[PDB]
Symmetry: D2
Subunit: 326 residues, 4 copies
C-alpha cells in the first residue's frame, strides 16, 4: 500500500520541512535501485575483478566499487541538496559546486562488503546525513561531526532481496524494492530490537589479537555460567548484512580493537556512525567498549573505530566485562 515516496513526503509534512531533505532522500533511493540492478547481474556485465588503484585506507578497489561510487556522487550532486560529500573511495572531501550546492553533508560507503562480492554474498550501501551548522564556506571540516548530529542514516542491503533501512529522529522503517515496478514498498514500520538475543557475531580468526574483555565474553557465550543454552554464531563478512540480522533478530555484532589495530577496522564516518544511529533509534546500543560511538568527535574524515552494537542487555554485558578489566 505505502511506497517510500509517500512515506517520506508525508514525514516531511509532519516536519514542515521545506523539501530539500526530501528530494535528497529520493535522489539516494534512486541510486540504490541503480546499484541493486547492476549488482544482480554483475557477472553477466563483467563487473567482477579489480579496476586498478588502491585507496586511502589501502582497499583494493574493483569495478563495482567505482560504478556505484559514481552513480551516487552524481545523483547526490543533482539532488541540489548537498554541499559536502565523503566517500570511502575518495581521498579528500568532495565540495559540491555552488550552482548545485545545498545544505546537507552526506558520508557514504558506496559498496560495503568487498570480500563477498566475488562469492556473491550480501553486499550493501551505507550513508549518513548531517546538516551544515556552519557559516564558513563548505570545507571538509563540516563533515567532522559526532554522530549525534546525524539527521538521517541507514543502509541498503542487496541480500536475497534489496532493502532500504532508513532512520531519523522518529524511529526506523524498512522498505523493500519491488523489482517489478521499481519502487520501494514499506514492509516494517517503527521497528525495535529485542532486548536480549541469541547470536554473537565476530571474526574469531583474530582470537590471538583480542583483548581480555572480548575473550572472556566469547567464552561466556560458549559456556553459559547459568546453564542456559549457549548462543549461536553468525558472521557473514558484510557489516550491513550482519548488522541487519542483528536488528531484526536481536543479539550483538563485534569489530572491536585488537593487539594490532588499536582502533579497530571499521570506518567511523561512513560505516560505524550510521549503524550505531540506526541501532540506537531502534532501541539498540553502540559502543567502542569505552565510549558510545556517536559521541566521538572525528578529526579525520577517514578514521577508524571499534564498534560493538545490538540488543542492550547483550551490549551491557560486554561493557561490564570491559570495566571489570579496567
Amino acid at each position: 500500500i505505502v511506497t517510500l515516496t509517500r512515506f517520506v513526503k508525508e514525514e516531511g509534512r509532519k516536519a514542515r520541512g521545506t523539501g530539500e531533505m526530501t528530494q535528497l532522500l529520493n535522489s539516494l533511493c534512486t541510486a540504490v535501485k541503480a546499484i541493486s540492478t547492476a549488482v544482480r547481474k554483475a557477472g553477466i556485465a563483467h563487473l567482477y575483478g579489480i579496476a586498478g588503484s588502491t585507496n586511502v585506507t589501502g582497499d583494493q578497489v574493483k569495478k563495482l566499487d567505482v560504478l556505484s561510487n559514481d552513480l551516487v556522487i552524481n545523483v547526490l550532486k543533482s539532488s541540489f541538496a548537498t554541499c559536502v560529500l565523503v566517500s570511502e573511495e575518495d581521498k579528500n572531501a568532495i565540495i559540491v559546486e555552488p550552482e548545485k550546492r545545498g545544505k546537507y553533508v552526506v558520508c557514504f560507503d558506496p559498496l560495503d562488503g568487498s570480500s563477498n562480492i566475488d562469492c556473491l554474498v550480501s553486499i550493501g550501501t551505507i550513508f549518513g546525513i548531517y546538516r551544515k551548522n556552519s557559516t564558513d564556506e563548505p570545507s571538509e571540516k563540516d563533515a567532522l561531526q559526532p554522530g549525534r548530529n546525524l539527521v538521517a542514516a541507514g543502509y541498503a542491503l542487496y541480500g536475497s532481496a534489496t532493502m532500504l533501512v532508513l532512520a531519523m529522529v522518529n524511529g526506523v522503517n524498512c522498505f523493500m524494492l519491488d523489482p517489478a515496478i521499481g519502487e520501494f514498498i514499506l514492509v516494517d514500520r517503527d521497528v525495535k530490537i529485542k532486548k536480549k538475543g541469541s547470536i554473537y557475531s565476530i571474526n574469531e580468526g583474530y582470537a590471538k589479537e583480542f583483548d581480555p574483555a572480548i575473550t572472556e565474553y566469547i567464552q561466556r557465550k560458549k559456556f553459559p555460567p547459568d546453564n542456559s543454552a549457549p548462543y549461536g554464531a553468525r558472521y557473514v563478512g558484510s557489516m550491513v548484512a550482519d548488522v541487519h540480522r542483528t536488528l531484526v533478530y536481536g543479539g550483538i555484532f563485534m569489530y572491536p580493537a585488537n593487539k594490532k589495530s588499536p582502533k579497530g577496522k571499521l570506518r567511523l564516518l561512513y560505516e560505524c556512525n550510521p549503524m550505531a544511529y540506526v541501532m540506537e533509534k531502534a532501541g539498540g546500543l553502540a559502543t567502542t567498549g569505552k565510549e558510545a560511538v556517536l559521541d566521538i568527535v572525528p578529526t579525520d574524515i577517514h578514521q577508524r573505530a571499534p564498534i560493538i552494537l545490538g540488543s542492550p542487555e547483550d551490549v551491557t554485558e560486554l561493557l561490564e566485562i570491559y570495566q571489570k578489566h579496567a
Copy 2:
C-alpha cells in the same frame, strides 16, 4: 555468449544422450528462476512467516518452504523424466504416476537456509540426480544410493545474484541468471577449488559439544604453529552460501558431529551428498571425519550426517587430527 540451454544440449550430444536428462535439467532451471523471483520480493508478496506444520526432521516450515517445494515437484513431474522424488518437506517418498514417469531419481531441499529467510541473507536450492538402476517398480528404495552414483548434482544460490551450480562427470560450471531476459548465462567453465585456502567456516557456538579433533583444529587455525598468519573466519548460516564461497575462495566448511548429535545435523540425501559431489568434481574432498560422504550407503531417505569439505590440503589436515585421536 553461451546460455545454459546451449551448454546442456551440447553436452548431451557429446554424451549421445537420448534427451531425457536434458529436458530434466531444463525443467529444474525453470524452477529455479521461478523461485528466484518469488524470493527477491517475498516480503512484498508477504511470503515471510510460517505456514503451520512441523516436519519430519522437526523443521518449522514457512510459506516460502512450501511455495518452492510445489513449483519444483510440479516442474519435475511434468519433465517426464523422473520416477521418484525426495523432499526435505515430504515425509515419505513421492512416487511419480506412470503416465509422466521416467527413469531419474531426484532428491532436493527446495529451500536451504531457513534461519536467514527473515533477515534476507542468502538462501538456495539443493538437488541430486541418480539414475534408477533397478527393475522393480519404483519404490522409495531407489533413492537409497551412495553419492558416487550421482549422475548430476548442484545448487542454486540466491545471493547478491542468482546462480546455478551444476556438476556432472565432466566437471563444474557456473551460470548466472540474467534477470532481464530470464535465461542463465555461463560465467565460469570447468572450475577447480584452490588446493589450500584461508578461511574456516563453522558454528562455534557448539564449542562445548565439539569433539577433541575439531577443537584442536580450530585452535590450530587461530594460533598457527608455524607463525603464518591465522585463518579468517566466515559462517553465514546457509550451507549453499558457505559451500559456494568455499568453492571459489578455497578453505573449508564444517558441520561435524557433536556431543549431542552423533551424526551431525545436515541431511545426507538432499544436502550433504550433492555438495560433496560438487566439491569432489571441483577437486575438493568431503568427509565425515571418518569416511568419505559419497561412500555412505543410506538407509533412511531422511538421515543426517557429519560433513567436512573444501580445499584438499585443508581437509586432509583435519583428517590427520581425526586419526590422531583415533
Copy 3:
C-alpha cells in the same frame, strides 16, 4: 544520461517554481509506470474482459479501465498538489479532500484505446493540467477552462515501448521507460512536427456521414491535383497512438463531426485538449474545422468535440476547403 526526474526538477528551478508542480509530475509518472506494468501482462493477470457498469459517455468499461483509474486517482490525491480531478470514468468531478488538497486541476483518460485492449494494440493515458485561478471553494467549475490555460499536458503511449510525452510552455520532450531500472529516460528534447507530411489518419467507415469538406479533402489525398504521389493512410484506432505517429512523422489526424455526431466523438477535456496543446507547442495546429480547439470554453466536463491536427501545411489545406464550403 538525463532522467525525467532530473529534467523536471531543473525545469522547475529555471521556473523558480515552489515545488508543487514538480511533485505533481512525479506522482503522475509513477502512475504511468504502474500502468505500463499491469498492461504488459494483462492477460496473465486476467485483466481483459469487462467489469460491469456502462459510463456517462456510454462506454463499456472493463477491468483495466478501472485498475488504472484508481492508481491514478490515488497517486494524484497523495501528490498533495491537486484540488479537482476529472475522469473519463467518473460521472461528476472528484473534489480532493482539504488535508491533501492543492492548487492544480487535472483532467484525464486513465486508459485511451478501449477497442484495442483485447487485440493488444497500443493503448495510452491522456492528461491535462490547469491551475486553479479561482478563489471560491473547489467546485467542478474550476475544470471548465479553455485549453489555452493548460500549464502542462501530455500522454503515455504503451506501444512497442512505453513513452511519456510532456509539454509545457517551453516545448515538448519525449522520455522512454527503462523497464529494467524503472525510470524514464529522455530521448528527444524540444521536438517539432514537420511542416507538411505524407499520411492521413481517419476512420473511413464513416464515409457516409462525413461532410463535404472532409470528403473532398480525402479525395484530394488519394488523387493529388498536382500529380505528386498520393498520401499514405494509417488509422490504428488509438488516438494516443495515431497522434503520436503524427507528431514524429508529420501528417494529419482526423475525428471530425459527422451527420450523426454534430460534435464528433472525442472528449474535449481529457482527450481533445491535451493533444491539441501538445500539437501546438510542437509547432502543430488543432481545429474543429471551424475554430481552434484550445479556444473553446467548455460547459460540460464530459462534452465532445471535433478534432483535426498535425502538420500546419496539412491542417491549413483542410481549413481552406472548410471555408470554401462555408
Copy 4:
C-alpha cells in the same frame, strides 16, 4: 498454469515426435524473448536509426532489423534442427553447416513493421516451418514449397504485450510472455475466427491503383446495400498487428495487387504464407483474389504476392466480386 514449454512438449508426445521439432520451437521462443526485450527499450539502447545497406527487396534496413536477424539465425543454428534458413534480410539462402544441421527449413521476417519502428507502433516477427522432403543436399530449392506443406507457423506480436501465436495441424494457441519470469504462458487455446466481422483493413492511399473488384468491395463496406450499419476501418501498418486483430476480432485484411504492383507487396515466403496458414487453421481463408495463397508454388525465395484473409463470409464476398469482374 500452462507454459508454452509444457504445451509443446506434451503435444510432441501426443505426436510421438522424436524431439527435433520441439527443441526447434523452444529455440525460437527464446529468440522472441530476446527481441521483445531489445524492443521495449530500443530508444534507450539507441537502436532506432538505420544501419546502412538496402536489401534485396529494396528495404531500408535499420539496426533492429539486424540485431534481431542475428539473434534468430544464431538461435536456430544452435537448435540443431534446421538445415535451411530464409531471411527477409538475406540475399541468398543460408545453408546450415553439417555439424549443426537438422531436417527443418525455416523462413522468417525477423522484424515486420519497419514503418512503425520509429513511432513505437506494434511490430512483430513472422516465421514458417517446412520439413525437408528431399534427399539431395540442402540447397535453396528446399525452401520453395507451397504453404500447404507447412508443419508449423506463427508470429510474435510486440504490441501492448508480447504474444506468441503458433499453429500446427491441430489448431491455434496464443501464449503471452510474462515479463516477470521470462516464460510464455498460454492464454487462449484452440482459437477460431468469427465467421463474419465488422472491420475492413486496407491502405486506402492506393485508391488510385486498386482494381475494380477491391474498389467495389470497399464501396460496399462504406454504403451497405442492405442498410446494415457500415463496417469500421482499421489499418495499423504492421501486418502482424492487423492480422492479429483480425484473428481475434473477425473481419478482413487486404494487401491486394495494384496497377503498379501486379503481385502486391507482401512477401510470400516469410509474410504471406505463415499468416494464411494460421488463418486457415483458425477457420479463416486466405486468397490472392484468384487463388488460395497456400497453393502457390514459389519459384523465388524472395517473391511477392497479393494477400486477402480473415473471416470466411467476409473473404467470400470479395472473391465473388472478383469473379464477377472476371
